[PDB]
């Protein structure tokens, strides 16, 4: 049989993945620190990548890409886009961002402030028109980013939202976009944060759990704006996912490594008034929507796990 260990007890995604592996009958779970495993569902912090791939007679696979944190932290994402020629400082789908320590770019940000001047400051939140206002809050590492003052608003409700997309990158560095996304909506009309936790503090007046899925959102775009989700939004989303992961592939690829890696990502996008998509952040240990846990986790076993360890499509492959 195949053997695996579980080192992240708080992962809702891979708790389901463990279940599916056990239900196969061909996967056996070992104790956390047993080194004789085929698959590691590793911890989120200080995952010991240096101890993988040194067991004779065991092909070893891990559910995290070493070095992928550059893409999945607010501070390092801004630096990655600014300093990579593939993304460049002229990148058109990432908002104007500046890293601020409480190198640093205070003077460059002020040269942008003096030169609508509403900005947001966040880290791993304050929306202000005055730089000193949000900056004094920082010192009280953060990143200052241009707040998208003109977002696409759903009707009825005049509501703001963000789009979460789940992306699976396997050991061959195939980029798989889960066909099912979710809109994490705000139940309060926009007045010139869409986090699920903040909304549980109206909530589900318009849809269950403040979550609008792609079939309803597409039908809305057809009825309201005479277009589709694929044409107006998804092409840009697939382009952004492709650009980000192809940029860091030489740094994180395990193609010729002694161990192999896959990882599930959660891309968060913002759509503005003119159906223009902006990348907000990338989550390296994302959760799923309750309706989509079964389908996506089964796809993780099929595409990322059973592809390496065979037994006895819901993804859109982003080619490159």
């Amino acid at each position: 049989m195949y053997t695996f260990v579980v080192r992240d007890e708080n992962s809702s995604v891979y708790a389901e993945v463990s279940r599916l592996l056990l239900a196969t009958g061909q996967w056996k779970r070992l104790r956390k620190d047993n080194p004789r495993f085929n698959l590691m569902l590793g911890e989120r912090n200080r995952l010991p990548f240096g101890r993988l791939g040194h067991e004779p007679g065991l092909v070893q696979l891990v559910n995290y890409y070493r070095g992928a944190d550059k893409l999945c932290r607010k501070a390092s994402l801004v630096k990655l886009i600014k300093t990579s020629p593939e993304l460049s400082e002229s990148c058109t789908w990432f908002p104007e961002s500046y890293v601020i320590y409480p190198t640093d770019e205070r003077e460059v940000f002020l040269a942008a402030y003096n030169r609508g001047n509403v900005w947001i400051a966040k880290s791993s939140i304050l929306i202000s028109s005055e730089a000193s206002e949000l900056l004094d809050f920082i010192d009280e590492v953060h990143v200052i980013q241009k707040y998208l003052e003109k977002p696409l608003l759903l009707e009825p409700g005049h509501r703001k939202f963000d789009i979460r997309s789940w992306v699976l990158v396997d050991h061959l560095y195939n980029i798989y976009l889960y066909r099912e996304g979710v809109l994490r909506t705000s139940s309060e009309p926009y007045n010139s944060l869409t986090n699920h936790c903040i909304q549980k503090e109206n909530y589900g007046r318009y849809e269950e759990g403040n979550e609008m899925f792609f079939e309803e959102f597409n039908q809305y775009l057809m009825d309201a704006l005479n277009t589709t989700l694929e044409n107006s939004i998804l092409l840009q989303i697939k382009h952004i996912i492709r650009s980000c992961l192809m940029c860091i592939e030489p740094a994180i690829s395990t193609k010729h490594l002694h161990y192999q890696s896959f990882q599930l990502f959660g891309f968060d996008f913002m759509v503005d008034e003119e159906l223009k998509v902006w990348l907000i952040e990338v989550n390296g240990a994302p959760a799923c929507a309750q309706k989509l846990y079964a389908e996506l986790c089964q796809g993780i076993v099929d595409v990322a796990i059973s592809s390496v360890f065979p037994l006895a499509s819901i993804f859109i492959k982003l080619h490159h």
């Binding site: 010991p48 990548f49 240096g50 791939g53 040194h54 004779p56 070493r66 030489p250 490594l257 002694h258």
Partner: protein, 437 residues
Amino acid sequence: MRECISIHVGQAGVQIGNACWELYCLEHGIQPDGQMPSDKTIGGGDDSFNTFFSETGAGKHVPRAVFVDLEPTVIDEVRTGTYRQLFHPEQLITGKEDAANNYARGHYTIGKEIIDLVLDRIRKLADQCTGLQGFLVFHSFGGGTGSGFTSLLMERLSVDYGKKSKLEFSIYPAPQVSTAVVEPYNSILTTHTTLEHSDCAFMVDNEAIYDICRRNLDIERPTYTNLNRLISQIVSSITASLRFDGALNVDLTEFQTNLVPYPRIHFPLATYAPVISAEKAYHEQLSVAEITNACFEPANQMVKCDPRHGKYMACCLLYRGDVVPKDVNAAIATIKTKRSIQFVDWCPTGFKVGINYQPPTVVPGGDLAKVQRAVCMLSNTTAIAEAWARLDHKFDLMYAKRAFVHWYVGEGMEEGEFSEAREDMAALEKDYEEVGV
């Protein structure tokens, strides 16, 4: 000209020393009886190969080497093998019973009985030197002799040869070819005691050499003869600058100067290419760019690790064969654009390059095919700390239960040396992570 003395300790050091001196003789044209016709200065001279070979009046070229093992089986094969005429009996030293894979037995119990004899025989070679510059020490981490006695020898060498450099070629333990379960103990114990006495140490993980022999030499179950012939090629690439005309790494001090800015972090990573099977009927020869690009693949490194997730402090490229500088620079320019090569901030981002026009010599009847150009990269990257993390973890698993500790305490060693040695490794891993992140 300044002489270098090679010291081979334990089974691994002796058998690897056999492969190196066999290769040295073929590279310099020295027959097994010690004769060297191309040496027109009979009885002496200060040529570059005299760094490793002294000369008798009859024209015999004798290695400046001493072989020491606590059991005679391995060195007895040197005494009766092809190159038996090369060494005089005084430089082959054997005890009666070995250290039984026990560091404390090789360092304290048995090592105390033989250390003064070994130094006396080392003193005999040093007396033949007009300007001895230091020692090259070959040994394993896992053996009782290669770990225990080497650390005792390294201590006394610092006492008796204070201003001399000392370099190591150390065999990192791999369970696929090891027959001792306590090798993590011996490795941590010998690294702690030797750390302050070694200026530069080249670690070779048997796991990496084993997989290179399986992958690129198509050898299903590689033997020590397979591994050591490959290891000897890499060692020859590293010591070629001491034995041939050139301007890079011309003395032992330059190894520390060019590769080790931080004294404790003195474990450079060696990468070698190309390794081509001699049974390969049709082989297309690799270019300078292809062999230079192969220096940044983990599958060709002496220790499997990911330099992409570390930082470089120094980097040398040692080419052998048809190589000219303009092709190296064109290769480096392309590799810099495509690969993750991050130096530490307080270091210049660059490469020191050495080219020897003589292509690598391969032992006749061996597994390695003759190639027209090869390269050995010596890079001091913090990624090699991955091997310390692996080893210290295996140490922590056994020592948490005090398993096998009674064998070491029974030889006079105190239990406190275990945690004292483990704490030094904890400081070493911390040093690497400070530099690397």
